[PDB]
Symmetry: C2
Subunit: 39 residues, 2 copies
């Protein structure tokens, strides 16, 4: 169970990292889309 | 440790679902950007 928790936590931190870069990517791309559409 | 593991798994499934939703959002926004970039 300790090993289970260990690799579950590894997958956890990978997941939060993924969510972080994907969220900032969405923010940047949405801002760019809005700016371009404003023209 | 079992109590920790159950809730670790539950949040792990939740984070996987959130990652899938974010990936779908990324796909939609990038398709929108590709469509808009034509003109």
């Amino acid at each position: 169970i300790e090993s289970d928790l260990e690799r579950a936590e590894e997958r956890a931190e990978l997941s939060e990292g993924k969510c972080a870069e994907l969220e900032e990517e969405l923010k940047t791309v949405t801002n760019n889309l809005k700016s371009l559409e404003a023209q």
